[PDB]
Ligand binder design. Sequence first.
Ligand SMILES: O=C(O)CC[C@H](NC(=O)COc1cccc(C(=O)O)c1)C(=O)O
Ligand SMILES: O=C(O)CC[C@H](NC(=O)COc1cccc(C(=O)O)c1)C(=O)O
Lengths: 431, 406
Amino acid sequence: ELVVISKSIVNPRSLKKPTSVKKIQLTPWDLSRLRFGYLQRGLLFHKIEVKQLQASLSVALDRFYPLAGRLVKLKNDDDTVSFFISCDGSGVEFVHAVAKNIELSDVLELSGSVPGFFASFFPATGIKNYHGVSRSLLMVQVTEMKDGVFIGFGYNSTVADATSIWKFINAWSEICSKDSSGSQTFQRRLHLKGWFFDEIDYPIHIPDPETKPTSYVTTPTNLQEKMFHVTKENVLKLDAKANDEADQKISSIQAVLAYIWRSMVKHSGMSREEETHCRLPINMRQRLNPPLEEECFGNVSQTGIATVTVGELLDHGLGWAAMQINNMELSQTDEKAKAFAENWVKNIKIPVSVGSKDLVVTNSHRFDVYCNDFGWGKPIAARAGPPYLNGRLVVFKGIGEASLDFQACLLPQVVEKLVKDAEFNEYVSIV
Amino acid sequence: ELVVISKSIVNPRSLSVKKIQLTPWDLSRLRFGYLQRGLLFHKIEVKQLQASLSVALDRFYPLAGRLVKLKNDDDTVSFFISCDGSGVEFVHAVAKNIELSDVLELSGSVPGFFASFFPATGIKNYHGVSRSLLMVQVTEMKDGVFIGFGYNSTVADATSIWKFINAWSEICSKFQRRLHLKGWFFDEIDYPIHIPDPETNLQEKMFHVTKENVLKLDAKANDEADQKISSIQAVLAYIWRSMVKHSGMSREEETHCRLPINMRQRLNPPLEEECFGNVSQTGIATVTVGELLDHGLGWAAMQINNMELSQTDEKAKAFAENWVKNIKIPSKDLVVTNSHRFDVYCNDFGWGKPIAARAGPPYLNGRLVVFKGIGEASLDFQACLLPQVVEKLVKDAEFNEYVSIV
Ligand SMILES: O=C(O)CC[C@H](NC(=O)COc1cccc(C(=O)O)c1)C(=O)O
Ligand SMILES: O=C(O)CC[C@H](NC(=O)COc1cccc(C(=O)O)c1)C(=O)O
């Protein structure tokens, strides 16, 4: 129940005399994601005016110009290909849609089988990162609802990590809020991530990612999504309990993730001998040597993986699970990252999926998603879009900074057991 | 914990004195405390809030008045509201360690820190001779702002106070008709009315009911009931049955659901929807515990609806006229307050709609403050409960399916 009003390309609006076309080189981290789908997130508002939003977007794209570029695929004479990002100002796909029968309650209170109507609010479903040669690296959809507006976006993981994407959304909202021409918002020089793998030749020669199985997103699933809210009081309670049991210092988010992990596995139906993983995004800017600037733009995120058996996770307590997470984070070193990049170049792996039997943590509690006031008020919710993956756990800072929200994608049988888990529902509010 | 930055008397912006006479409904509430409610925001600029309040008091000028107490020669007293522009008490305070999470998620013993966000705790309606009839406190938090207010029930009902808040925020964000007062609608009662001189371990939880679960309860109640039942009647009945189930009361006890009734359209002649003043009464549905527990949701909902249908003009008149010859100026009930009809979120003062609405002290067992949800189809309730009832409610699987308790 969604009609498209307009589909257009939004180009950067360049007050400056345009410079040459910058080329951005792709690392093993970027190339190993070429077959994954665009990541899709969005913000819910009481009010957004689309004209101002589109105008301010063109200005913001000038300031974050790699988001307006395209992948370029080179054919090597050895029958491999190479990719780089060309900052050519090709522009961003921008969709204006209307879903006049959908109201805020419907998106705030989402609960149950996915995909549902909400999937259609996102613009990049089924788009893979290697499609960025011909589709934009950022895609935006603004959907007017009965009594609100949703701004959804999808982005190519080869051009940006979530840290960078949320910095762009914050700049865009600031411009939109103050004046759409950008004349009243400070322009800042963009620092690029650059090339930080000094022992790896580039561009890296890889097999063509499109000459690969190419697997569907519209296939029927049995997945559901639920929202989990953890209050400040309960975050603190979990934090204290994890630290009481643990032998090293455990952060609040580690304790809460460990609690969710244990609970998710308790109700999974997995055998004790199965391995379960907690996959966590790690911002590597400050772990690399030399470290990169905290504001450098691009994907500088690595996925850390904590591995245990189901039996181990259930037999030990909360503090032990939190220690597995923390130990994994501590292991994500510079020497590790570089050695592994050099191994990747001699055993290229570009998977189509992550796997469905893990806790797959994404986004971050650190991103101030509510600071995105476009001029009519801060958002009232932050959500993720397709694709749907069992075990996905999207982390959002709460409207209350001390609280946490999680958007969890789970099998129906797991939800059914989770909603009857008395202790879980003491610590976590499921909607 | 709470630091006061400033206190001001805000009069109407514009520079005989109109008298508003008090009805038996007003006079009966003289010993009650001021009612206190408020709105939570990301951002409020205090200077603009205060200037706009002066402008708003031009329109809602009774809120800037004072009670006047007359001593009559027959050893009684009389009260009226003198619209003298004395002004509204306006307090600016800072709670630097309190954050949005704390107010959104209040849960547990009351009174707690939040009580201090409200300006009129311990103030009774008869104190309006010397204290303002509306009191405002704007409390800056670590990462947000709360606008708390208390009001004297002799000058306004909740319908009127929320219309005032709506007008104030509209003025601050920047009226085709002038303010019309409710007037004297008891033609068989003389004024001023002569009266005698009028002078617990509780917890609060937030309940949210989703659009989906409101509709489920509505459908259930209507399937069971023989008259049409509204969504709010169905949800209130469900909460009522659940509270009584976990109350510890025996079958023979009488228990009540108390509900605010806007009487404007029930009076004859009916009064204008926007007429200003207190034109509300409390309706009381009475049942025994055993009956409420034995019968289903639709029957409880019918008890509420039947009570509402009985709130007639003729009854109100007869009761008021006898009240003047039997002045009465004064639990484990369901005490419903506020209403789903009030649009909480239209109160944008210029920096964004509110992110929550809340009630303040006083705290009383069984209070259930109704707020329309951010999601317009949904409902929020601020419930004041005994710890033993809470413990039973959190272990009630069905209740926690229909209602999200935080
Ligand atoms: O950015 C991240 O959270 C991981 C990025 C990347 N993974 C994918 O790009 C596809 O798998 C996922 C994993 C998590 C969330 C989603 C989603 O669509 O939200 C998809 C990786 O694992 O290195
Ligand atoms: O407006 C209403 O809900 C009732 C008004 C009045 N009642 C009192 O003035 C004192 O009893 C209450 C009842 C409900 C809430 C509170 C509170 O403090 O929120 C106090 C009455 O019965 O006509």
